[PDB]
Amino acid sequence: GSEFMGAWLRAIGLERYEEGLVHNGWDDLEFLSDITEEDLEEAGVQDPAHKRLLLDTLQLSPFRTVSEWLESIKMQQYTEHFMVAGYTAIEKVVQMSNEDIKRIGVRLPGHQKRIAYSLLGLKDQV
Numbered sequence: 001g002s003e004f005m006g007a008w009l010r011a012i013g014l015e016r017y018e019e020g021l022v023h024n025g026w027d028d029l030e031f032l033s034d035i036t037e038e039d040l041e042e043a044g045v046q047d048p049a050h051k052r053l054l055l056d057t058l059q060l061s062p063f064r065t066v067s068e069w070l071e072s073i074k075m076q077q078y079t080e081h082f083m084v085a086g087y088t089a090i091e092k093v094v095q096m097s098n099e100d101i102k103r104i105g106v107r108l109p110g111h112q113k114r115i116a117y118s119l120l121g122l123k124d125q126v
Helices: 002-011 015-023 037-042 048-060 066-072 076-084 098-103 109-125
Strands: none
Touching: 002 015, 037 048, 037 109, 066 076, 066 109, 098 109
C-alpha cells in the first residue's frame, strides 16, 4: 500500500524513491512485483545498484462486472473512465489494448501495467 510501501522502501534504504514511484502509479506493494528495470528508470530510480536491490527484494515475497474487477486491483478510481468509453462488461474489457487503456484516461504507468497484467488473467478465465 502507499504507506506500507514507504516502510518497505525505508527498510532497504530506498525511501528517496517513494515519491517518484507513487507519482508514477507504483503505489501499492501488492502490485509492485511486476515492475521492471525499465519501469524503475522511468520512475526515477537511475542508480543500477538501487534498482537491483529493489528488484532482488521483491523476489523474496470470475467477476460479474467491470466495477467488481477494478475493485479487486484497487483501480476503482477509473470505473467511470471505463464505463463512459464503452468498456462496460467483462467481455469488452478483455479486448482492450495498452493503447485503449491509455486513451480512456489511465495515465500513470503503474496503473496502466496493473490493469494490463490483470486483463491477461481475466481473458484466460473467460
